[PDB]
């Protein structure tokens, strides 16, 4: 892995960052509410008389079990567009409140029920915000709403005109019924959801969790915080969840992160040996997966700790170095130098009787390579 | 009369716990050191953007509010009441007395004379603050009950208001009133504007102090 | 950028090698931080220790010498200094030298200078009594040695009383060390606070674009986050290069002051304090070094009248190493920085020429 | 960036603290230019004549 | 339709300002090394003999 | 269509080039400090005794 990181076949002595340690998780756990109250859409999608286009209706679907699959696959809908969220992932999310608006328009006016359109319908009958989130559903209803002689009961604002619907109208002039579902998320504690698909729960163990919408990873622990009521969690400093409330039992649990860090490889050089030692940086040496040695800089594997002290060779950190000495690899607290007491007294002096001439070198970079790049040709 | 709030009408902007963190928010607040009407004992007021509302007594003369646009039929309105039993939220089309109240025998409730088309029901000294707001068809109510050591004057101090209710009505509101228990045998009204505040959070997660960032150069 | 999600991680591969460059840059600046410390403090070969019985001529170094009953074996003034001043892909590496090792280095420098003068920075340490070293340093600023030996107790009392005031003024100023800590923390916080901006997307969470969008529509929204987060990380890495190039020059100046003020006596003006440099003492600080500069300052001046030369027997006499002065009626020679008048003789003057070319000659 | 317009300011608000960093960077430079001059020229206690 | 173009304008104009500020940072560190040399010259060549 | 694909290449390559030039400017300033120190050593160590 070091040879691959450097892109070479000979690594010289050093210490190299090679990858990262990510304590993978295990066992997932959902946590929806005490499911029960289902949703009878068969009132808004099964009405005997719809509502005008200039006074649309507005039903506020609420806490329930919504199954958008019976909608999505019913194949009876001529138009099913989802904007904030693709359709298949609806039965796996939870919001605060779903609104359903209902009305009746012409056939070729269904393209103005979309975010950012213009026309007599979207201008002043029914306007969709520019960051819509829900889905728009529409189906033809020629046999129900159009009657011989003209059905003049379906008006629109243009101040009011009436579609005169008649059964012998070309498509694009026959009545279409439209339902606009708009999922909103204020700031409550929770609301409607999906089939859920069962659930479970655990503790102490890197895990992959979902708490009625909150998707995350980490270790869960008994949240012994002063977490008051009228809440649903609490993202402390930095703005991180760092805590949740279990919907079913209503207890606070902290979500510390999952252990991880960097991985370094210590080598004496391939021209000396092919043995290697490995540093897991600031990881406790009990959660890594001989010589396992704990350092202030992480957990070291593959080197033995000695009690001697040498000059530093390969720097590990916090005063610890490594060397290939004692045919192997070992750690130790580098030495600063040999000790020396000077024979100080108040009437003693040391005077030299000889000398040496010394010559030493000093090297300094003066210049570098002059390069130009044509910005256009690059 | 008019009076001066000092640091009053701070509510928790939402759920989500929190500790020592001078957190900054933009929302609808009652500005510090404001000009709050004074009422003694009442008339139809405006709403226009939320409302602060305090009150002081040991008996219970303040017996809820009534909201809406017209406070009559032909359009819908809310009604929040409390007899000596407990709270009664209600949403119908009403016919409200232009001077509606309740008596204190102890027979009462000359408030309305109509309860048609009800679309929502519910049944079941002192300083009592309330913050009323109405956003996206939701009528939010924050509240707090502090004990004064006076009887009926607006005190000074800091006390954050905790959310109480949430009603998915859809109702339009432009006006509101009050309800009082007559004699047969003091309250204020602030308004809320879009301000930016700096809230100081305790280690238990309560708001202990705040800064209004548009008062003066120091703030 | 991605936070352990394979969808974002595959889109990121399309950007080439930006993230190997960023790591190379940060590694290059984390190695030179240990190189910075090594060249300020490892300026000794031996670890010198001071003698058990400490009689340095009346001078008292007890507040700057190591204290065994203290934490990390620091001096008393090294403690006042250390009292005054795990996430998502972000880690902090420890320095190679601990604080104990750096306090060891400064106590070896300080025991070398108290005990050998400037000899240990040129070769083997040769001991000399402390007052004779002080007399050599007085010679180096142009005062004679009898001025130290006749004022020993006063000079030692002034030194002790002036070391006693550093301790008060600090115990009761390390803004240059506080600012580099603050700047780094303010930048690391701005880096994390950017993980919650949209940059023109529907949310800031990848588990929210991967939950209400189909894969063909979530690519366009994930790329908007990738571009923003890459920009923010690369801004962080540029400003660290520019801040490290400034810390490097400060450490290069500290390494020169350790050589020229602690292992020598400097003649450069205002390089090792204000006054005439006598000696310097190092102390370690959290991410830096404090120098205590001891200088000589002249005081209590008088005026006299001067002449450039003296005429006598038709010859012109100039002082060998002083100035001719007059107290009103008599003519003496002093040394130029300390008043100590002497009779003008042929032992402290020399002759050149006759006394009609100099302007200002006096007869004496 | 924007410059008067208001459709621009709300869109730029989506980029976080990019503009706060730049103003801090430029303010540090301007405070350093006065310290440069104080260090070169104000090297004297008294104003001598 | 307009938000799309305004985001391109914003991106370009923010890139220009970052280029400007980074170069001012690099150019001020060069002026500081020069004022440091001037301070040492004023100390050592004007307030003394070198 | 060619234009929309060419613009992403232009955007990526411009950023590559800018990173190269900024890191050359930071490295040339380090080489200049070294060359000033070597000039000072040439004057003070070869043309005199220090
Ligand atoms: C509205 O109600 C009708 C009748 O209950 C539902 O129609 C059923 O649709 C399924 C699937 O297409 C058919 O297998 C049944 O035969 C239909 N019912 C009858 C009586 O034949 C319709 O699904 C409902 N609409 C919605 C949106 O739920
Ligand atoms: C959701 O339902 C479960 C049961 O289906 C409730 O669990 C009960 O919790 C109480 C604790 O107050 C226990 O005494 C019961 O024995 C539990 N019942 C079972 C079957 O385990 C749970 O409390 C419900 N959720 C809420 C919020 O009340
Ligand atoms: C050097 O100075 C120190 C003062 O910092 C002297 O130590 C203290 O002296 C006072 C006065 O007698 C005592 O109360 C303290 O207990 C001493 N020790 C401390 C403060 O740690 C010290 O005696 C002086 N050295 C000599 C040789 O006189
Ligand atoms: C040196 O002699 C000069 C000459 O008198 C003194 O300077 C004068 O001092 C008086 C009183 O302080 C002032 O009023 C004059 O303005 C000074 N300048 C002149 C007269 O030119 C000076 O005090 C003497 N210095 C010392 C150290 O005694
Ligand atoms: C200048 O200094 C000389 C010192 O040599 C002073 O002259 C001597 O003063 C003492 C005491 O007044 C006498 O005992 C000597 O007899 C004097 N002469 C000699 C040759 O020593 C002189 O007074 C001083 N002048 C001034 C103005 O202070
Ligand atoms: C310094 O001493 C010389 C010699 O004693 C003086 O020179 C004499 O000056 C007088 C008066 O001007 C003349 O009459 C003599 O002819 C000079 N002799 C010689 C050999 O030059 C000189 O004037 C004295 N200087 C002062 C300022 O008194
Ligand atoms: C590298 O290998 C060559 C030949 O194999 C040998 O001469 C040299 O000593 C080796 N270097 C080290 C550091 O062992
Ligand atoms: C690693 O975990 C064990 C178990 O709690 C603990 O005893 C040990 O101190 C930890 N490591 C460090 C370096 O503290
Ligand atoms: C090192 O010395 C200590 C002395 O406290 C001793 O306890 C320890 O066993 C020694 N280590 C080895 C590997 O011998
Ligand atoms: C409140 O406003 C009214 C409006 O006229 C004014 O008369 C009164 O003085 C104001 N009160 C305060 C406390 O500013
Ligand atoms: C209190 O008022 C409500 C309002 O309708 C009413 O339903 C309730 O019965 C009243 N309490 C009693 C005890 O009648
Ligand atoms: C509301 O009440 C009026 C009068 O009682 C009635 O005409 C009307 O139909 C009611 N509203 C609805 C939606 O039924
Ligand atoms: C509230 O009144 C306004 C009057 O401008 C009206 O346009 C709006 O539709 C009303 N609210 C609802 C939910 O209808
Ligand atoms: C609440 O806060 C107080 C003071 O901040 C603290 O003493 C107490 O432990 C906290 N928790 C409580 C009262 O449950
Ligand atoms: C000094 O100036 C005075 C004027 O007061 C003059 O008489 C004398 O000759 C001058 N002496 C010298 C040495 O310049």
Numbering used by the authors:
A (entry chain C): 298 to 455, 491 to 621, 640 to 676, 690 to 741
B (entry chain A): 27 to 67, 81 to 143, 153 to 172, 187 to 247, 264 to 297
C (entry chain A): 742 to 826, 854 to 940, 944 to 1135
D (entry chain B): 742 to 790
E (entry chain B), F (entry chain C): 988 to 1037
Describing publication, verbatim:
The spike (S) protein on the surface of SARS-CoV-2 exploits angiotensin-converting enzyme 2 (ACE2) as cellular receptor and mediates the fusion of the viral and the host cell membrane during infection. The activation of the S protein requires the receptor-binding domain (RBD) binding to the peptidase domain (PD) of ACE2 and the cleavage by host proteases into the N-terminal S1 subunit and the C-terminal S2 subunit. S1 consists of the N-terminal domain (NTD), the RBD, subdomain 1 and 2 (SD1 and SD2). Here we report the cryo-electron microscopy (cryo-EM) structures of trimeric extracellular domain of the S protein (hereinafter referred to as S) at multiple states and conformations, including the all RBD-locked, activated, S1/S2 trypsin-cleaved, PD of ACE2-bound, and the full-length ACE2-bound states.
Additionally, we solved the structures of the S(p), S(D614G), and the trypsin-digested S(D614G) (hereinafter referred to as S(p, D614G)) proteins with overall resolutions of 3.2 Å, 3.1 Å and 3.3 Å, respectively, which all exhibit one RBD “up” conformation and show no obvious difference. The SARS-CoV-2 (D614G) mutant is associated with increased viral load in COVID-19 patients. To our surprise, S(p, D614G) shows more digested bands, which means that the D614G mutation might increase the flexibility of the S protein. It is also reported that the D614G mutation can change the conformation of the S protein to accommodate more PDs of ACE2.13 Taken together, the D614G mutation might increase the flexibility of the S protein and make it easier to be digested by host protease, which might contribute to the increased infectivity.
